[PDB]
Amino acid sequence: NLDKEIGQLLMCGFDGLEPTPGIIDLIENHNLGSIILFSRNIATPKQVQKLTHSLQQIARNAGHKRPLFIAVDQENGVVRRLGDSGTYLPGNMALGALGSSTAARNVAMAISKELLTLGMNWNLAPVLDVNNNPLNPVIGVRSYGQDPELVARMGLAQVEGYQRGKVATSIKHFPGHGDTATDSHLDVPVINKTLEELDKTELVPFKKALEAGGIACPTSVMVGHMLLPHFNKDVVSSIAPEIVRDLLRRRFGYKGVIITDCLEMDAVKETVGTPKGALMALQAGNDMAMISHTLAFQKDAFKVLYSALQEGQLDKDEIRQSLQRVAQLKDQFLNWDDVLQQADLKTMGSEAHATLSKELYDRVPTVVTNRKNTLPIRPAQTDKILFLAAHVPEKEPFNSFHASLLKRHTNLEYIIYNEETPDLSQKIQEADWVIIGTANANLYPFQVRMVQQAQKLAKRLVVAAVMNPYDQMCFPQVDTYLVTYEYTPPAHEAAVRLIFGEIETRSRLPISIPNVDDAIAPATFIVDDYRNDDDLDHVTAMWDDIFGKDWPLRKDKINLGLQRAKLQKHKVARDSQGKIVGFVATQIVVVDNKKHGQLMLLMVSPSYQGKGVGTLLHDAALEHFREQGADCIKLGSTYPRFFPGVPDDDAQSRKAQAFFSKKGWRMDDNLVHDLIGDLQDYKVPDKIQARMLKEKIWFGRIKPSETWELYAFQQRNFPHWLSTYQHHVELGDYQDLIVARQDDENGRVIASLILNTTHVSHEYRSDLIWTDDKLFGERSGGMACVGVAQEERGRGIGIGIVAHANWLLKQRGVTKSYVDWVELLDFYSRVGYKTWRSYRLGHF
Amino acid sequence: NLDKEIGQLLMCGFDGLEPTPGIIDLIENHNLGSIILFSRNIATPKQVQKLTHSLQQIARNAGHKRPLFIAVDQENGVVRRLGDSGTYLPGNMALGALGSSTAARNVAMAISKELLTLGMNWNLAPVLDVNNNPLNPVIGVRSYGQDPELVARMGLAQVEGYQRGKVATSIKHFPGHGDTATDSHLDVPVINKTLEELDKTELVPFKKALEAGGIACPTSVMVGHMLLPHFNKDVVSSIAPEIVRDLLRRRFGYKGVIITDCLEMDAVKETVGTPKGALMALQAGNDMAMISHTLAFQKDAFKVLYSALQEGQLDKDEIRQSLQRVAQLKDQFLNWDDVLQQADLKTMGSEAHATLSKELYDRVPTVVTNRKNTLPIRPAQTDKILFLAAHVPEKEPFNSFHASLLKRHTNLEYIIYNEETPDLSQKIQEADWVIIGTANANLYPFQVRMVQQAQKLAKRLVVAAVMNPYDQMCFPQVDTYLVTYEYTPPAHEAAVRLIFGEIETRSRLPISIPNVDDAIAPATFIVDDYRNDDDLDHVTAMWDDIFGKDWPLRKDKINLGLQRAKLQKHKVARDSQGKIVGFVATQIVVVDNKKHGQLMLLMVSPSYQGKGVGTLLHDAALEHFREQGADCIKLGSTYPRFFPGVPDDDAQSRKAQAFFSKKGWRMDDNLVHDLIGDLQDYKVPDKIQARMLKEKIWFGRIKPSETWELYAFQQRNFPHWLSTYQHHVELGDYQDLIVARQDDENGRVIASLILNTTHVSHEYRSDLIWTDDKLFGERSGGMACVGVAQEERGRGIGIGIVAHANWLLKQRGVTKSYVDWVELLDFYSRVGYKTWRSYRLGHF
Ligand SMILES: CC(=O)SCCNC(=O)CCNC(=O)[C@H](O)C(C)(C)COP(=O)(O)OP(=O)(O)OC[C@H]1O[C@@H](n2cnc3c(N)ncnc32)[C@H](O)[C@@H]1OP(=O)(O)O
Ligand SMILES: CC(=O)SCCNC(=O)CCNC(=O)[C@H](O)C(C)(C)COP(=O)(O)OP(=O)(O)OC[C@H]1O[C@@H](n2cnc3c(N)ncnc32)[C@H](O)[C@@H]1OP(=O)(O)O
């Protein structure tokens, strides 16, 4: 009935660097729909492309309707299956400490690119567990931090990032594994909390992800293994319908794929059979069962499901809906052509991703205490440095630390200390500097003793914790302590750079360290909602301060720009004393029925630039868009607008272009221009008069009863402008809506454009805001949305109607004319317009 | 201015039950604007009225422009000044535990009523401090609870309630005194937190309150005395401009009054002079200084300000702004007539408030643990009960507790234990039941010993913590433990009621008790936003369960009512398993440019009524209105609409009316009716045909070009209906818009009404939803917004246009006609309408 088809509901691993006979059977006979891989299987880039293609080949020959999913746990920091095949980029708490959702988004994009070229098309990530427990072993630095809002902010960003690169996601571990001291792999963790308690922390990031507007909403959710007595005290969360069906499916109304964590962990293997745990998972409402590692359970589980399917121990109607959800998920990401074609090995962003890693990691480690100003250290060449590193329970992970120390200082001793290590007192007292490397000392007593010992003896001690940042809770006497949030080579490089004062701590602890309350606070800026009643004068002053030379702009024009923005969301940045230091403007517009986010303006005061304020505001902007589902984002705005893209005619502006591309904005190669035209003594050239006379073209306004003819025109020929014409009509600016007609005032509309003139057009028209005496004057105007019908092209009408528009402006007393956002410079050269300012567009 | 005027910026108290020469001097000569009273000054209702009236007269007599403010700390739990002059109603944590914002609002209203009648017109309250510290001596139960969101919720509701009752407020203590173990009256409390930290908890309730839309936004804010080293490490927040101006005035942009806590507290007096401190307070940016007790300081402080005014040590410009803010505030609440009248002491709601006290306190105390099912106790008359209570550091608080037990049991011994108390072991073992009253045992070790002692010896133990609820942290072994949240007499009464099983625990701990993980969790219901894609069928089902008998209503009509709701915010209530058990519907509409909140519908499944679900949904709705500033609230809705008020034709609906009035809704004495009229064979009466023909009145549809004539009519004569007409015009239903014109189809508009007809009117018209075969059926229609110009009344037009309306409807094939929400029954009786259903309206 559904015997072969139920293979799509599974995900299974294997051992080695090429397909086993096991998984070949499962795929070919039992229609297995998803694979999972680990470092065991990741040989190296060439081997993996082959491996993924091999599995894919066998799947197609075996007659699968859709291609396999090939999943992996790529969380990036401490946990990372790529190894040396792919780039080291910051893991979760590292990113949390870094504090930029944009940074995290980019990391996920960079990773998905790498995974997709190798054949991975499903990253089991991100982790949305919240780390409010100092002693959490399993989810330590795998969580972004202690604050559920920070976890949401960063989580959404990565789900976007990964899925933006055509790779599926799984937010985990539902309902929240971050609050326990118990490890899921070893024992059964208990979360003794009610739904009300869960709503306040655990579920915050999950709720926010599920409610995301578009690409930032995850495509699957993973249910970990934890006991929740207030919901189900008999069985673990993955197989309890109170957690899966009642909470995730019913309450939250989640329509996507639900999958389990590995059913071979002791939390479910030592409560029931892993083949039994597979049945109870799908009974609870899971769409999918995970069985990584040991084949035998994979065989059993399959036969367990077949028999249960015969009885009626599985609701056949529910399994159909599950198979439907898995089909939908596959159709979103998978197609046979490019799944088999494979991409070239150089299409991994290896070089670009490498320079991202260097750039990010310099902003990661935190100096937590520095009571004696030991850091930065500036030893003399002949000073003896003792570097003591803890043993690990990857093999010698503190060797990269050692390497990085060597680049700065060679008179160095490197010892890996453990429980057995003979007494090192004498070395500690003799050395001029002692550096100790802890790795979860708060879980490994020998490290705490080592640090406490050295504290008594060392001349100058510094302690770097490279796993969880909580270690100093065990030795608060230590005056100088820092954290790297992960033991990766680049995290150690950055940690050494920090120690030698090459770099400066910019990150902020995403965590509380118990018994350590004098944490060092960097200068912090906070983002509030813009309040026009209170903030307008300051924003006005900021504009003149930054743009006043080339773009002087009075308070009311700024206010017009800002107050008329659709679905607006403007923010300011304030220092600790509430003084405004930066501003960002923002609107959302619908085009083709896609939400479009427009970043209208981003600016910060000169004396406060280069402190991360721009980045704060910028992230607040994209985080808002992200939640709203504004997935197509633009630099500058259409209407209303300060700039259509990024100014190009001064250095500070071009510098701001680099700022934006470096964050991930795709800037255009070519420029875009605003034109200026003198009309002092403008006459319509005779050739055009004669042409328009010969063609029998009529120009003039549209009347209210004729509006439909102008809308009909725009709908057929320039639908992207209809809303602009409609906006003016709402204000009653009919005198600015000029049309060309055939023969006379009753002929069909064959062309049109939008005039504007200072003091004539409605006060809420932002067509021309540059009315300062040093730019365009009082006696100023312009035109826009110029267009001729397709049928009527090549009769000289376009140049006619523009030339007429110039005449009309001259009639109104206009001496200086503004043609905004155009490219055909030779066209407007024929009627006296030379270029005024240039911009480079950007989008995302 | 300016020296006389500065007295308006001061608040001073005094000794006795009549004016001292001291304050008489301050009022008469120094222009003191505000008084503060304490228990010293309150003896009895009669004498307080005489006191407030005397103070008020002297101010009037002495030539004050505006009345004195008369302030008091009336927090209602452990902090009260009224004593027995006013009703005992639940203090803060009692209300947090109770869990209803409507209950907190209703308390404040009752208290502001009692205060005003005595001449007290400023309550220094509510406390928005968040109590996340288990050891907090000041601000224990004075805080609503641990969750800042709960504190905001209740805080807004009380600020509404007090100001609703024409009494001023001061939210306190900015920036948030909830997190310390140090007491402000004794020593300087330190809050070592950054702005970013404070924003997470301390400042949440203050921000929520400051951003409230209308009456729930507070009119003053008090700044406590606490050291914040990250902002200012030299002086306490009261006199630190980094807290007062930079944070409250600039960053939050608050425009109301800022006032200090008492400048006589040791935090201010023992750091710097109390006179000196008043100068620094106004320098920091405070509007108003408090000096509650000592005449010498009140005298000196004034002398310090007069000299400070001379130099220019005070920004004179800033003082004028302050004086204007005080003037603003006084003008909002105070006028000489009411302030000099002494309202009858019958107009204190004493008997009603007594009833409220009883009703609420039954929903207050919580049974926290009851492992042995000791509660409820059922002692035989001859059993011996021993009651041991802690000494206080009032009188003998647990006394009332003693009196309450006596009523249930005669054989009872009562001993107030302390440190000196000789051993009591013998009586404990001998007693059948032992009851121990603790009063912050976690602060007083002798109580912990006493409980530990009894834990082993006593036969059957129950422990009642009557101050802070945290006491069981000191003795988790105790199986049977309850808490009252305050030692007021009715809190104790309710506690005893719970002990003997007369009542049952309905509250939930608003707090976490350390070392007690097994709290008795009652079965709870959580409220989410209504999702129409998931919940429509269930809400439709729920409708049929509850109203299906007399009001059968199809899904699409329910969906129309709900989706067309303006500024909608609908909620559902689920149980732990996500099953929907209740629904509330809501919209906001603007009339006279005030926001009007409309409670469209409130319903819960029958099997789930009487479990607090209606209250949960109800409060969620009122919290939303309160925040939005929708201060005029209605039962039912205008357009769209299920009901215009509460139905009256069945018992369940009449019972639901009681439900609303108990919560404080004002229900009308009279009813309001929907009408039904059979048109099967209707004819226009001959007398009316004549009258119309005689008055030469013309009827017919309004044409699009004539729309302005209809709007002009409605504007001049029925402004409250304009928006409904406009709504129908947007849909294009001109064929339902009938007018009366003078002679002719071109005559002035003199009357109008709105028709509707099933399958003829636009699909989004909700005029008539009752189209079920058993109600009005498919051949159905109606009229609304029937109105004759005031200059044209008594020409039989009203009856003419309505008689015409029936005719037109009959022309359409309508047999049953719906006239909704009317009163003039005899009028519609003349055209064959009898009453169909009746509703009682309700407002707040
Ligand atoms: C569509 C439009 O909005 S167009 C208008 C854009 N505005 C302008 O053209 C002119 C005004 N420009 C500005 O206000 C600013 O220069 C902005 C908005 C472009 C950037 O604001 P800033 O606060 O300087 O940004 P931020 O401080 O995050 O700068 C990031 C860079 O500064 C450096 N930096 C930031 N903080 C630190 C720190 N604590 N220590 C050392 N270096 C730092 C980094 O190198 C970082 O990356 P990059 O050098 O690779 O670019
Ligand atoms: C605009 C319109 O909506 S028109 C109104 C139309 N709606 C209806 O008529 C629907 C029919 N009625 C109902 O659905 C419900 O009865 C409602 C909505 C009126 C009230 O909902 P309920 O859930 O019953 O209210 P709730 O349970 O909060 O309180 C009801 C009573 O039970 C009591 N109660 C609640 N929980 C408990 C408990 N755990 N133990 C003991 N008593 C309790 C309350 O104190 C209250 O007592 P009171 O009668 O002395 O005031």
Residue of A196, A246, A578 with shortest CB distance to B524: A196
User: Best of B602, B616, B844 to mutate for ligand 2, by most ligand atoms within 8 A of CB?
Assistant: B602
In chain A, how many H helices and how many E strands? 26, 29
How many of the other CB atoms lie within 10 Å of CB of A516?
17
Collect all residues with Cβ–Cβ distance below 8 Å to B150 and sequence separation of at least 6: B96, B144, B510
Element (H, E) at B726: helix B722-731
Q: Which of A40, A30, A24, A37 shows the shortest CA–CA distance to A10?
A: A30
Test mutation, A198, A251, A533, chain B, max B CBs within 10 A: A251
Element (H, E) at B701: strand B698-701
Q: Which chain B residue's Cα is nearest to A522?
A: B194
Residue A677 vs residues A680, A755, A772, A814: alpha-carbon distances, Å:
9, 14, 16, 10
How many of the other CB atoms lie within 10 Å of CB of A318?
14
- Rounded (5°) CA angle B401-B405-B408: 155
| DSSP string covering B796-835 | SHHHHHHHHHHHHHHHTT--EEEEEEE--HHHHHTTTEEE
Q: What are phi and psi of B424, to 5 degrees?
A: -120, 5
Handedness of CA B584, B589, B592, B594 (dihedral sign): positive
The experimental technique behind this entry is: X-ray
Ligand 2 centre from B213 Cα, in Å? Answer: 29
Collect all residues with Cβ–Cβ distance below 8 Å to A96 and sequence separation of at least 6: A143, A144, A145, A150, A151, A154, A485, A510
- Dihedral of the alpha carbons of B13, B14, B20, B25, in degrees to the nearest 10: -40
Which is it for strands A10-12 and A34-37: parallel, antiparallel or unpaired? parallel
Give the CA count within 13 Å in the CB-facing half-sphere of B108.
32
Cis status, amide bond into A126, omega within 30 of 0: yes
Chain A residues in contact with B192 by the CB 8 A cut-off are 517
Element (H, E) at A306: helix A297-311
SS3 A582: strand
Residue of B147, B253, B574 with shortest CB distance to A531: B253
Query: How far is A586 from A590, CA to CA, in rounded Å?
Result: 14
| DSSP string covering A413-429 | EEEEE-SSPPP-HHHHH
DSSP designation for B242: T
End-to-end CA distance of chain A: 47
Which residues of chain B are in CATH 3.20.20.300 domains? 1-364
Query: How far is A481 from A471, CA to CA, in rounded Å?
Result: 10
Rg (CA), chain B: 32
User: Best of A603, A642, A643 to mutate for ligand 1, by most ligand atoms within 8 A of CB?
Assistant: A603
Query: How far is B220 from B125, CA to CA, in rounded Å?
Result: 10
Q: Identity (one letter) of the amino acid at A534?
A: D
Q: Which atom of ligand 1 is nearest to the CA of A637?
A: 1
Handedness of CA A306, A308, A312, A317 (dihedral sign): negative
Q: Which of B731, B725, B722, B729 shows the shortest CA–CA distance to B754?
A: B725
Ligand 1 centre from A402 Cα, in Å? Answer: 34
| DSSP string covering B467-520 | S-GGGGGG-TT-SEEEE-SS--HHHHHHHHHHHTTSS------SS--TT-----
Q: Which of B330, B239, B252, B243 shows the shortest CA–CA distance to B9?
A: B330
Q: Tell whether ligand 2 has an atom less than 6 A from the beta carbon of residue B602.
A: yes
Residue of A250, A517, A528 with shortest CB distance to B578: A250
Q: Tell whether ligand 2 has an atom less than 6 A from the beta carbon of residue B155.
A: no
Query: How far is B724 from A95, CA to CA, in rounded Å?
Result: 54
Q: Identity (one letter) of the amino acid at B615?
A: T
Cβ atoms of A249 and A255 closer than 8 Å: no
Q: Would you state the structure tokens that stand for residue A783, as one six-digit string?
A: 């035109």
Collect all residues with Cβ–Cβ distance below 8 Å to A218 and sequence separation of at least 6: A159, A163, A169, A170, A171, A209, A210, A212, A256
Residue A310 touches partner B, C-beta closer than 8 Å: no
| DSSP string covering B540-591 | HHHHHHHHTTT----HHHHHHHHHT-TT---EEEE-TT--EEEEEEEEEEEE
Q: Which of A76, A113, A123, A82 shows the shortest CA–CA distance to A95?
A: A76
Element (H, E) at B433: strand B433-438
> Nearest-CA distance from A251 to chain B in Å?
5
The active-site residue out of A15, A84, A185, A556 is A185
Q: Which of A217, A244, A218 shows the shortest CA–CA distance to A231?
A: A244
Q: Tell whether ligand 1 has an atom less than 6 A from the beta carbon of residue A614.
A: yes
B1-364, what's its fold?
TIM Barrel (3.20.20)
Q: Would you state the structure tokens that stand for residue A509, as one six-digit string?
A: 């602890």
Q: Which of A377, A604, A645, A415 shows the shortest CA–CA distance to A499?
A: A377
Per the CB < 8 Å rule, is A574 touching B230?
no
Location of structure tokens 């504190």: B151
Location of structure tokens 């990150």: A507
Q: Tell whether ligand 1 has an atom less than 6 A from the beta carbon of residue A99.
A: no
Residue B315 touches partner A, C-beta closer than 8 Å: no
Is A261 among the residues known to form the active site? Answer: yes
Handedness of CA B392, B395, B400, B402 (dihedral sign): positive
> Nearest-CA distance from B579 to chain A in Å?
8
Residue A204 touches partner B, C-beta closer than 8 Å: no
Chain A residues in contact with B246 by the CB 8 A cut-off are 576-578
Chain B residues in contact with A579 by the CB 8 A cut-off are 250
Handedness of CA A544, A549, A550, A554 (dihedral sign): positive
Ligand 1 centre from A614 Cα, in Å? Answer: 5
Q: Identity (one letter) of the amino acid at A140?
A: G
Rg (CA), chain A: 32
Q: Identity (one letter) of the amino acid at A273?
A: G
Q: Would you state the structure tokens that stand for residue A515, as one six-digit string?
A: 């018994």
Whose CA is closest to atom 3 on ligand 1? A601
Q: Which of B570, B576, B531, B539 shows the shortest CA–CA distance to B555?
A: B539
Q: What are phi and psi of A351, to 5 degrees?
A: -65, -50
Q: What are phi and psi of A481, to 5 degrees?
A: -145, 140
Residue of A242, A253, A574 with shortest CB distance to B251: A574
CB-based burial of residue B372 (10 Å sphere; 0-12 exposed, 13-18 middle, 19+ buried)? Answer: exposed
CB-based burial of residue B822 (10 Å sphere; 0-12 exposed, 13-18 middle, 19+ buried)? Answer: middle
State the angle between helix axes of A297-311 and A274-284 in degrees (0 to 180), rounded to the nearest 10: 50
Starting from the edge strand earliest in sequence, which strands make up the sheet with A366-370, in order?
Answer: A366-370, A480-483, A461-465, A433-438, A385-390, A412-417
Cβ atoms of A688 and A803 closer than 8 Å: yes
Query: How far is A367 from A482, CA to CA, in rounded Å?
Result: 4
Query: How far is A656 from B833, CA to CA, in rounded Å?
Result: 74
Query: How far is A696 from A489, CA to CA, in rounded Å?
Result: 76
Collect all residues with Cβ–Cβ distance below 8 Å to B473 and sequence separation of at least 6: B134, B442, B513, B514, B515, B516
Residue A197 touches partner B, C-beta closer than 8 Å: no
Per the CB < 8 Å rule, is B199 touching A231?
no
Query: How far is B770 from B763, CA to CA, in rounded Å?
Result: 14
Test mutation, B529, B531, B577, chain A, max A CBs within 10 A: B577
Test mutation, A246, A533, A535, A581, chain B, max B CBs within 10 A: A246
Location of structure tokens 């509460």: B646
Residue of B242, B531, B579 with shortest CB distance to A577: B242
Q: Tell whether ligand 2 has an atom less than 6 A from the beta carbon of residue B99.
A: no
Handedness of CA A362, A363, A369, A373 (dihedral sign): positive
Q: Which of A286, A443, A364 shows the shortest CA–CA distance to A95?
A: A364
Q: Which of B466, B438, B465, B464 shows the shortest CA–CA distance to B450?
A: B438
Beta partners for residue B169, in sequence order: B123
Query: How far is B157 from B155, CA to CA, in rounded Å?
Result: 5
Q: Which of A751, A743, A681, A760 shows the shortest CA–CA distance to A721?
A: A751
Q: What are phi and psi of B373, to 5 degrees?
A: 50, 35
Query: How far is B2 from A394, CA to CA, in rounded Å?
Result: 76
Per the CB < 8 Å rule, is A251 touching B199?
no
Cβ atoms of A131 and A140 closer than 8 Å: yes
Q: Is A812 annotated as a binding residue?
A: no
State the angle between helix axes of B148-164 and B613-628 in degrees (0 to 180), rounded to the nearest 10: 70
Q: Is A614 annotated as a binding residue?
A: yes
Residue A531 touches partner B, C-beta closer than 8 Å: yes
Q: Which of B424, B499, B413 shows the shortest CA–CA distance to B461?
A: B499
Is B287 among the residues known to form the active site? Answer: no
Query: How far is B810 from B802, CA to CA, in rounded Å?
Result: 12
Beta partners for residue A673, in sequence order: A822, A838
The active-site residue out of B3, B185, B187, B843 is B185
Q: Would you state the structure tokens that stand for residue B6, as one six-digit string?
A: 């500065």
Q: Tell whether ligand 2 has an atom less than 6 A from the beta carbon of residue B615.
A: yes
Q: What are phi and psi of B720, to 5 degrees?
A: -55, -15
Give the experimental resolution in Å: 2.8
Query: How far is B347 from A195, CA to CA, in rounded Å?
Result: 45
SS3 B347: helix
Q: Would you state the structure tokens that stand for residue A806, as one six-digit string?
A: 């110039």
The active-site residue out of A147, A261, A535, A674 is A261
Location of structure tokens 């960063």: A154
Collect all residues with Cβ–Cβ distance below 8 Å to B533 and sequence separation of at least 6: A253
Q: Which of A520, A186, A171, A173 shows the shortest CA–CA distance to A370?
A: A520
Cβ atoms of B364 and B485 closer than 8 Å: yes
Q: Which atom of ligand 2 is nearest to the CA of B655?
A: 19
Q: Tell whether ligand 1 has an atom less than 6 A from the beta carbon of residue A646.
A: yes
